[PDB]
């Protein structure tokens, strides 16, 4: 609405999860228009914005194709997304069979394991109001070790399921390109060369890269 | 496999996440065998069980009427017991339909909202190698805030959706249950009192009563 799009996406600029669902979207030749909701202005504590995620967090989804549904959850989105318009199953499992909830699996992984811990380091890193070192390490170790969880599957399998990319691996790409900022002394190729390989092979991919340049350029101006 | 019902499901007795999907097993008259996972002997990251879960965390569930399909990640596997078994949709949204998405969106606030940040909670409480203040207020205000959200939304709605009880109300229930009684001073009808209805609604089914006064009993002297 304002655009012509089918897609509404409201995400922040700086923010994992958004970018996420965008990827999603560029690979199933869907159009949507970004709508930048800006957390450093605690816009998405706005009632407006609250009125379409009562959590108030970023981000969140209008499909405007199909009567302006609302969804939030950024795994949530990339479910409805993949489910309701990947119907050639180019980067998805099928619903309803055993492969889905394998793919299912691997995104609560993401949602769950991923984000909220990969979340806290830098929030330990930039934000905490007091400087801690014994929570900055806390998280850095968890960082690794989900690293260690993905090289464990990945260095016996290409994909993570159904052997083909789909939405489960394309959802740790945001996080884990961001998170190698925050990492001291850190060379992911060689720590997990498998899962490295694995991360960029998805980032080469213009699909990705185009929404992930356009967070780049978003981001170097204020 | 050393026992005849449909389900293993592998747990650690103190965690919320295996009795959630305990709840939904019995929601649906399906028959399951709890198998526990001693955290405390760090059995959640043995070679055995780290084939059924190379994440190394309890829980994890077979099952033996599907060919002994394995599946990790509670939220993940309430979603495909309740898809798979839930044929007369008691509990649970139709797949293939926007609710269905609904519903996926709450349980995805579960587990990467609630859970998480719960868990934190109780870590610098309890189990961080110092005490940091700091830390333990930040994660108990977003406790506040998780139970603010739902309580935003059940105080206009009696479920989160469908307008019926389903597999996303029933998520929030084991780790909200052991926040209440893990905070000191806190009067949960008083503070949030259309979550807490909904809340002691559904402990008070016997369904969910049932998997959670053995995890007492079990936690118990
Ligand atoms: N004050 C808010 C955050 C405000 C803020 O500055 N937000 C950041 C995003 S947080 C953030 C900042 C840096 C990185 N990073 O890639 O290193 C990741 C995240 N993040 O979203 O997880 C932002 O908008 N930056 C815009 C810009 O850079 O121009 C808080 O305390 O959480
Ligand atoms: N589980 C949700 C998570 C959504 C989420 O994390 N949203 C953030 C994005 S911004 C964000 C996300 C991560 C981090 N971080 O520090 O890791 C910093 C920022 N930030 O903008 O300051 C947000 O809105 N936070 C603001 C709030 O909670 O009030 C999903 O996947 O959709
Ligand atoms: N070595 C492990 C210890 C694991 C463990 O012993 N489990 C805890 C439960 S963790 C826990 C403790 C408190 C709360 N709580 O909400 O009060 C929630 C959780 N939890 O598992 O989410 C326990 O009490 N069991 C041993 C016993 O009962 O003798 C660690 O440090 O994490
Ligand atoms: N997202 C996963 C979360 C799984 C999870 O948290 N598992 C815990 C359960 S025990 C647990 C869960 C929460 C808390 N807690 O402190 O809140 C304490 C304990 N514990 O046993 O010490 C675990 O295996 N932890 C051990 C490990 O990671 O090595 C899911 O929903 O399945
Ligand atoms: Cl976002
Ligand atoms: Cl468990």
Redo the contacts between chains.
Sequence with gaps: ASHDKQFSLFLHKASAHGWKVAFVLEELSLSYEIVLVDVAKNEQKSPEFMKLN???RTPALIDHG?SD?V???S??MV??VA?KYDTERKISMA??T?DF??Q??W???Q???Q???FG?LVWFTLY???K?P??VT?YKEEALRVFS?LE??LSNQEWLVGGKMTIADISFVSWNDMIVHFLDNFDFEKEFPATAAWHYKMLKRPTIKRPWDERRKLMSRQ
């Design positions: 009562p959590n108030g199909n549904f969804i939030w959850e795994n949530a479910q409805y489910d619903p309803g055993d909830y394998i299912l699996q995104q609560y992984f949602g769950t394991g984000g909220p811990y806290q905490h109001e007091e801690i014994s929570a806390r969880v464990r599957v």
